[PDB]
Each structure stands twice: as C-alpha cells, then as structure tokens.
Structure of Transient receptor potential cation channel subfamily V member 2:
Amino acid sequence: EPPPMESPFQREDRNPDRFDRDRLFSVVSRGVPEELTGLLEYLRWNSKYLTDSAYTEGSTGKTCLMKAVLNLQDGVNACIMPLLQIDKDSGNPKLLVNAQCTDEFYQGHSALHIAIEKRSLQCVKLLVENGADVHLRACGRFFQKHQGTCFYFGELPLSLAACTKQWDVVTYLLENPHQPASLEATDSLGNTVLHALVMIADNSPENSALVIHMYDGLLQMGARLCPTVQLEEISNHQGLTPLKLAAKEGKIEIFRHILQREFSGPYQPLSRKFTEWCYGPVRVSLYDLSSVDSWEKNSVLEIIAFHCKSPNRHRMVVLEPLNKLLQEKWDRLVSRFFFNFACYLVYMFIFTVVAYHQPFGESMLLLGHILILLGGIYLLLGQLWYFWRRRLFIWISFMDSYFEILFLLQALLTVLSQVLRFMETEWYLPLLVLSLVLGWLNLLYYTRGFQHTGIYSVMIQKVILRDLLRFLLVYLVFLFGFAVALVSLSREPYRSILDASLELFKFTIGMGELAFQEQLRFRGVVLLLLLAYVLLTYVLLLNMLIALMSETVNHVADNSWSIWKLQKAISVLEMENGYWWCRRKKHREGRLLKVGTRDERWCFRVEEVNWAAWEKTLP
Amino acid sequence: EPPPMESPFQREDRNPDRFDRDRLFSVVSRGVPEELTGLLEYLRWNSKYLTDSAYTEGSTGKTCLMKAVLNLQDGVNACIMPLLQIDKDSGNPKLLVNAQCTDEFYQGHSALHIAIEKRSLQCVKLLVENGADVHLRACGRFFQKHQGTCFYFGELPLSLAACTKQWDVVTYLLENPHQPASLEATDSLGNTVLHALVMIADNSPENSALVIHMYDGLLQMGARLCPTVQLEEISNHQGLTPLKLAAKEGKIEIFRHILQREFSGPYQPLSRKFTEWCYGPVRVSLYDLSSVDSWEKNSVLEIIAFHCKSPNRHRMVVLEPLNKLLQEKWDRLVSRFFFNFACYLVYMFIFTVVAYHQPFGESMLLLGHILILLGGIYLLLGQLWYFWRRRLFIWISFMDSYFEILFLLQALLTVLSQVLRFMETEWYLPLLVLSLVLGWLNLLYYTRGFQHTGIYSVMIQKVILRDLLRFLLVYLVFLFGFAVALVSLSREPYRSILDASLELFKFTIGMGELAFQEQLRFRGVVLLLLLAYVLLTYVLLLNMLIALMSETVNHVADNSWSIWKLQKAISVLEMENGYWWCRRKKHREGRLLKVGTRDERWCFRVEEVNWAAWEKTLP
Ligand SMILES: CCCCCCCCCC(=O)OC[C@H](COP(=O)([O-])OCCN)OC(=O)CCCCCCCCC
Ligand SMILES: CCCCCCCCCC(=O)OC[C@H](COP(=O)([O-])OCCN)OC(=O)CCCCCCCCC
Ligand SMILES: NCCOB(c1ccccc1)c1ccccc1
Ligand SMILES: NCCOB(c1ccccc1)c1ccccc1
C-alpha cells in the first residue's frame, strides 16, 4: 500500500547538538523556529544538505519543507522561512524549494503544490519568491485520472490553483515578477490549464458554474498576458483542443458554453457566437465552425459520433450550431440516402425472387444469381471499408454499430452461399436463405431517414433487444438442466436432449403437452419436473417482465427525439465520405466572414426563434 | 385490565381528627398543605407510617407521595415537602421517597420517576435531597419494551431523563452531591443509559438528532465524571456493546454516528474516525475497528449479517469502514470463492454425466458414482455444520439462507439416492434426477460473486419468488374444488381427480381442451364449470399481476446494489471460517496505531474521494 501523504499518528517511513531526521521533522511540524536554529551547525558539521535522502522518508522522498507546509497553522507556518534560509547557507546544489517526491504514487509532488492545495497565499508567495518552479509536474499515480484513489488537476501549480478556484493564487502565479507561470505550459498528457478544467468538469450545475467561471476568466486573462497566443488551439498528445476534449469526455455543460460563447465589449474576439440581428423572438447568430465542421479531420462532429462513449452523445448533437449544421447536411444528403435505400430495396427484391423461384426464365434466374453475387461482394467491401476506418474504436459504441455488423454478416453469407453454389454442395440453399432473412431485418436500418417512422423505432430497440439475451442465458441453463433430467428419467417421448429441449421450449409458447405421458414408469416424478419447469419458467418470465417494465417510469420522450437526431448524425458523417469506390470531396460549411481584429472565421448563420425567451426579457 | 397511573375521574382501587386513606389522597392531589397539618397526629395516634399498605392502593401500591407528584401545579406541588417531613417524624422504617409500586404493570415505579417525566426540576431536586435513590429500577411490564402499551426508557431515573432530553435533569442527577447517579448503572436487561438511547432511537431525523445529541453529550460528560471508565465497553446480558446493539436493532442513524464519530479538540480520545490527511476531494481517515472486525467473536459484522433481522441490514454494510473492510476481505477471498465455484461445477459436471450415461466406460461410471457419493457426503456435512453454527438464528433470515437449505436438500437427496442404489431399488433413479435438477438450480448462488451478473439477479428474487406461493395456495384450493366437481359430474375424460386436476391446469398454460366433450349427458353444465374456471383463473392471474406490478413503483436501484453488497458480506463472513474439515485462523484487519493518551487502536485506513462534498466547502 502506498504510504500516506501526512500522518499525525503514523510515523514516516524509515527506509554541535545532533539534528537527526526524526528531530528535524518534529520541529518543522510544530512550527517553532526557535529550536531549529542549530540546524545550520549540524549541517555544516556533517557537510550535508537538507535535500539529502537522510532527511527524507525513503518511500517517497518527502522533504522537511514539504513536511512543514503540511501542518500550516492558520494559513502560515513560521518554520518554513528559516528552513529555506538554512538550506541556502548549507550550499545545497539541489534547492529545497524545487525538491520533488520519487514514489510512484506521489511522483513530482512538490512543496508548492501543498501550499496551493492548503489555500495559503502567504506560503505560495514565500516559496515562489525563493525560486520555487511554477512548472513542476506532479506526475504520480495519485495525480493521474483513473478509477479509485485519484485527484486529477492537470499536473501544474497553476492548473491546481485553477481547479480549486483560488482566484487569488492564479492571479499571483500569472502576474508575479519572480516566476510567472505560462498559460501554454503543458502536463505529461498534453493537457494545458484549460484542458484540465474541461476534464474535471461534471454535469452538475454547482461544478459547471465553477468550470465555466474559471474557463472564462483564464481565457480573458490570456488575452492580456499573451495577446498573440490562442490558448484554445493547443492540443494534447491525442490531438484534441479543449473544445474537442469536452466532446470526447461527454461533458455537455462545458461543451455548450464553449460552443456558444459570446462576450460583449473588449473581449469580443474571444467569442464564438457572434449575434447578427434580432427582431422580436427571432435571433440570428454567426456561430463559429472552427474545429467544428466535418470538413477538417478529427472534428467535433466526428468525435461525438464515433469517438465519444458517454451516454451524453445524443444530447450534444441537438445543441446549436450542431443541430442546424447537421440538418443542413442532412437536407443535402437526404436525396442520396433514399437512393441508397432504393438500391438496397432493388437488391433485396432480386434476392427474394431468386431465393423463392429456385429449382427466358432460366436466363433471368442466371442473371439474378450473378447480380446477387456482385451485390454481396459490393456490400462486403463497403462494410470492410467501414470497419477499417473505424478500426480504432470498434466495440466502443456497439449499440449504434450493430446494424453495420448485420450488413456485413448478411454480405458474408451472400458471398459464401454463392461460392457454395459454385461448389454445387447442397448446403448453399440454407446460407442463401439466412442471407434473405437477415437482409429483410437489415431493412429496418433505413427507417431512421423518416421522422414518422424513425422516432417510433428509437423508443423500442434501446433496451428491450439487449435485455432478452440476459433472460435467454439463464433460460438456456435451465433448459439444458431439465432436458438431461427428463432424458435420464424417460429411458426405462424425450428420447434425446434435443427432443427434450424441444418439448420443454414448447411450454413457453403455450403448446406444451403436459400429461402423464401414459408410458413411463416414473410418470408422476417426470410430471413433477414438467410442473416444476412450468413454475420456474413463469417465475423467470415474471422476473423479466418486472425488470423490463421498470424502465418505463424513467423514460423521457425527449431522449427518443434526441437519439434519432444522433442516428441521423452518424449516417450523415458516414455518407459524407461518399462510397468506398468513390471518395468524393467534402464541402466546407458556412461562409468566411470578418468578425474583428486579432479576424476572419468560417461562421455559420443560425437563426433562433424563441417566443418564451423573448417574452421573459419583456416588461 | 391494569389500573391507570392517575385518574381525575376514576377513584383509586380499594383493594385527633381522622386522616383515613381517601382524605389523605384528596389533600395531596389538591396541593394544600394547610389541611395536611394534622396528619402527624393521626399517624402518631395509630403508630403507623405513610408507607403502610393502608395508605396506598392495593392493586399497585401507589403511595401518597407518588399521588402528590402526579398533580403538579405549574411544575411544583406545595404538599410534597410537608409530606416528606411528616413521614420523617412518623419514624418510618421504609422512607416514602424510596417507595415503589408492587403491581406487575408498574413494578419499580417511584416518585422520582414521575417528577422526571413531569419535567419538574424543582421536585427532582427536592426528592433527591431528601434521600430518593437515583438507582431505582422501574422494572414493570409497562416499562418493558414490547408490542402495544409500553414506554421503554431503560429503567433508571438518569436513563428516563436522558430519553426525555431533560438536559437540566441529567446534569443535576450526575453532579448532585446528595446522590449522584453512576453512568455505569445498569437496568435489569443489562442496558446502561447509552444502551437505552440506542434502542429508543428511530430512523426518523427528528428523533435521530435527539439520540445523537444525547449520546454525544453523555459520552463527553462521562469523560469528565469518570475519566477511567470507557462507557461503550459495557455489555448487556446478551453481550452487546452500544455499537453492537445499534447493529442488532437495525438503527442506522445512531449506528452510523457511532461508527464514524469524530471529535475535534479535548474530546479527541472519544473519536472513532481519526482523519489523517486531506488533499482536494481526497480524504483519508483512520476508522477504529474495535468490536467491528470479524477477528473477534460476536462482532458488528457478524451481528448485521446473521443476528440482525431488520430490513435495514443492506444499508448498514455500505457504510464506512464496513464497505471498505468487506471489500478488503472480498478481494482476499475472491480467489477462494471461484475455486469453490470451480469445485461445484466439476462436481455437477460429473453429476450430469453419470445421470445421463446410466444403464473403460463402465469403470468411469463406477468412479463417477463413487465421486458423487463422496461429494454428496461432503456437501451434507458442510451444510449441517453451517446450520449447527447458525442454530441460534434459524428461520430469522430465511430470505438469505434459502440457498443454504437448497444445498443441504440436494446433498441429502444425493446421498439417499446412492444408498437406494446400494439397495438396488428402482426408486433410486428419480432421487438422483431430482438431485441433478436442484443442483443446477443451486448454481445460481454463485452469481453473487460477479457484479455483472449478481446485481441483476438481486432485483428479481427479492419478491417475485415469494409471491407465487401466495397465488398457488388459492389456485390449488380452486383446483381441487373444481376437480371434484367435474369428476362427480362426468361419471354418468375426467375419470379421476388426478386427471381432472391435470386437465384444469392445462387451461392455464394455454392448452385447455374447452369443448362440449360430446359424451357427457350434462355437457352444457360441465362446460359451465370449465368456463367458470377459465374466468376465475384469469381473475386470479389478473389479481396476481396487479399486486405484483405494484412493487415496481417504489423500487430503487440503489437497494439492489446495497443488497448485493450484503450478499457478498454474508459469503465473506462464512468462508472466513475456512471449511468444516479445516477451520483456518482469522487474520486481524488494520494496523495498531497510537491515536492519543488515555491510546493504541487497531485503526483501518479508509480513503474517501468525494468531489461533491469538497466543492460544497469551497467558496
Ligand atoms: C440501381 C440498381 C442497383 C442494383 C443492385 C446493385 C447492388 C447494390 C447493393 C446494395 O445493397 O448497395 C447498397 C448501398 C448503400 O448501402 P448503405 O450506405 O445503406 O450501407 C451502409 C449501411 N449501414 O448502395 C450503394 O452504395 C449504391 C448502389 C451502387 C452504385 C453503383 C456501384 C458501382 C460499383 C463499381
Ligand atoms: C477439484 C475437484 C473436486 C471434485 C469434486 C469433489 C467434491 C466437491 C463437492 C462440492 O461441490 O463442494 C463445493 C464446496 C464449496 O461449497 P460452498 O462454499 O459454495 O457451499 C456453501 C453454499 N452456500 O467446495 C469445497 O468445499 C472445496 C472442494 C473440496 C476440497 C477438498 C476436500 C477434502 C475433504 C477431506
Ligand atoms: N409507412 C408509414 C408507417 O409509419 B409508422 C411506423 C410503422 C412501423 C414502425 C414505426 C412507425 C406509423 C407511425 C404512426 C402511426 C401509424 C404508423
Ligand atoms: N455470463 C455473462 C452474462 O451476464 B449477464 C447476466 C445473465 C443472466 C443473469 C444476470 C446477468 C448480462 C448482464 C447484462 C447484459 C447481458 C448479460
């Protein structure tokens, strides 16, 4: 187990007048500099420095200075200032202010971070004035974002202060002449201070206000300290800007504010929603499409659809300008979507004809077999190309890509069945039939193109289809357990497990032949198993109905509309790439408009009609 | 019927100037000492005392002094003080202040208790200064905790004052020089004052604040009056400390406060949650495992799992440190749990093989029969050992031990079937089959080891399985009633009750042959019974569905997670004892740490990450 950061009870790890390690740590914690005065003599006598491993705990390397700042008294510790002085006179080649832990848990932890966390501006000023680096990276396992014991604030003192909304500390760390902290400074994972605020943000409104206020103030202060730097353009090692990161992490509240950010006054160039004109309840705004339009790779639209895995994906594609941007794309692509639907209907109309009318008529059948083979190959190549593109995030959103698997599965069976027909084996007919069955089920994918049908479909396939596998797994365990019991008991009907499993399943569809069976010597006991099976399978069905019905209470119809918009969003961003055989170019959305002075942006004109909001401002 | 305590309307039970009993009780109730002045002369004339049975009601022994305190006027009665004086001059060998009732209902009731209940500090001071014992036990049936007419406050004046939050009275009873009341003082059932507050506590928050405030103040005052006494270490006749009693009675609010009690300042040694270090939303506390760890017999963990019967059991195993303590144990024992699961799967894989493949192959069957016999004996001995250990609380938590019954039942049938095979009777095959059926159903017990499967299972078996027996009891009554009717009507199909019961049941599984039957002379009337049975059995099914569906509204998913944690808690505390053939030693949890001065405790380090709570304290 990793050692604790500070412990009044547990002692630190062991692994002129004497000033050994234990008595050194005792005086610094109590905050009495009077007893510390002889430390310089002992250090001079031994020709050693406070940064030496002898004056720290070997498990972490926690120095005496870091010990001192962990027991602040009313926001200050009188022992830390003499401690730095004695270190200065000791001739330390490694200054105590810049000392860091070495443990895998608290790696990079420094005395400056402790002072920032303890909300003591006095210690923060005192350490920085003495040369405490403001770019020390606390890159330990405790500070990394993961399940369980963690506190991610970035890795920098400036980012830690921002995450604790210490407005006084961030002001000093930026404006101090001794050692200013750059806003461009970057942690080990590529996250800046703005990125850190994004990925600590929750969807709760108390913490969303914290992040939005910190994000707004730091962005506005960045315009003063570094006017030539656009802080939102810095990307992590994953290549994500703070806007893109908010999309991937699925944090709507911070995502919405950045996407619709508007500043009035001198800070206008930092805005992303430039209002254009208003007439009554009609508002027109020029939303900025920088890093939002799908024309550029790794955009926000692609990240939400294919890279985000949070349950908040459907609620993000309805925010402006994404709602209107996707609608603008959908109206341009709805003609192609129906053409794709028409081609699949023709392909499966031919599939049905060949499957049924199978042994000029022979020539039509010969052509039908050939067209099916080409159609199956075409679908197989298209689906393989889709999975090749989405190879980095397979099985991450299987609830949405399950139709793309079915199209591939039907394509594989279509091609394989034709191959078996070439081999003239009798087993080609089944595979051709299962291809026909799956494809007619795959026709339900295109219902998303119609609001009239797509909205209704969304309410259904969300949970119910995934629930049935959970009942079947127990039911099949129950089915095989009773089947062997009946077979082992009827051998002195149910001639084999396969027949016994068949008979037991018939009881579920209301066709069981629950009788004495008139033949078996153990007719009563065999009946007991059938009666027990009937009671057990109805307990399981009632167990299923109650659990499934529980989802009805919490359902909201707005979610079904939102999910349908996400389904159209995924389809648009896939068919924008054209086809596998023809990767047509992508049209850039919006128009280039000058919005200020650094300032031209690819703005997208969104018009907003809202009677309720307009009447609220009215007297 | 027990007589009333006080009655303005009903007279008390009958069973110098004259001062008979009736005129004595009249003056004391009215509170006029002027008419009482001659009482000394009458007592002197008769050479009698007020404590004599003549001056009380024979049904209870309620004395005149207890009569006086039952009619206090504005918190005081002017007659009680002269009453004690006249008793003093009467030469009473049994002082009136210490007089108690003799009725089985109000046994031990004294005048001091009445003054405490009536919230009169003036009478409380007046009686105690005259020698009223502060350790009088009111051990009547009225003061014992039971259904109906009762008021349990312990049995002592100090405990009564604590239960009525009379802060002024408890202060006096503890600090009075005349007769201080010991906090160690114990009632008839072993309960001290701290125990009394625990078992009058409700889970409501108005009364929880009452108990917590009284528990905290009395514990803190105990450190001043008796610093050398640890009041929480006193146990009842059942052997339960106040912490253990709160667990058995299932009162979370008082249980949580004691389990996580933290005091800052001089009262630190009374704490049980010693905070260690804090960094942002990360809090680390040293919870005390005294009487909590399962290493010691009759611990809190065992009491909640096996001794508590309240519905609050699942909500207690999620409180810290119990939540982390059980998780620490579970991670150490999850390797053994799967090994136990693997052994049962192998045992039932062999059971299935022998059951099916039954008349080198013969040698394998011979070995399989032998291995099943040893496996059945092993399970039989293990389950008997489990019930021997839990013999004191069988059928108290049958909802949790019902799987342990099924394992025993399957073990008994496994052994008995092999015994019958030795006898070479034909009836061994059925019992071996029912053993196979039950064991495959017993495999559902091990689903609790996986969160992925255990959580889903908990939602189902809570109510639905127990509900079906309630429908079947009426249905079987309906089944036998109609079966005899059809048989008595078809004798001029349904040749016997057994066949008639079989045919009627088929209508429930959607296989009834509801026809005119073409043979019976009373074909129309027999059809009426079948039609009536169909309507009646669907009314019962609709009755069942509506009643069962009503449970969906009030269900909370947090309960299912909590119950699963309790299920793992029971399994851990059972497999900690090793096996019946090898009772391996128990590992003590936590580490011994010095926390103060009486002070070393077996503290358990629990680390708490809570962003929402941390942000609440932030500006
Ligand atoms: C008009 C007559 C058509 C006769 C049948 C020919 C084979 C069609 C096979 C087929 O079903 O293609 C469907 C496809 C769209 O699939 P999707 O985007 O829904 O799939 C994704 C679902 N998630 O549609 C297309 O890609 C367009 C059709 C092919 C155009 C010409 C191809 C030339 C190749 C060199
Ligand atoms: C590995 C090969 C095993 C072949 C079959 C041998 C008989 C096993 C019988 C069996 O099912 O035992 C299950 C048992 C655990 O039961 P539980 O704790 O779930 O039951 C409680 C459920 N509520 O498991 C155990 O206790 C461990 C298995 C026995 C170890 C060696 C025993 C030696 C005896 C001298
Ligand atoms: N082909 C048009 C049918 O669309 B509807 C539809 C049909 C099947 C599944 C989902 C929707 C419909 C919607 C509302 C009322 C009636 C029908
Ligand atoms: N063997 C793993 C199956 O677990 B799951 C499961 C199966 C039966 C009963 C309870 C749980 C499951 C849970 C959620 C979705 C799908 C399946």
Q: What stands out?
A: Strands of chain A lie at 273-279, 282-288, 591-594, 600-609. Residues A 469-470, 473-474; B 452-453, 456-457 surround 2-aminoethyl diphenylborinate (ligand 4) (CB under 6 Å). The CA atoms of residues 158 and 170 of chain A lie 6 Å apart. Chain A is about 55% helix and 5% strand.
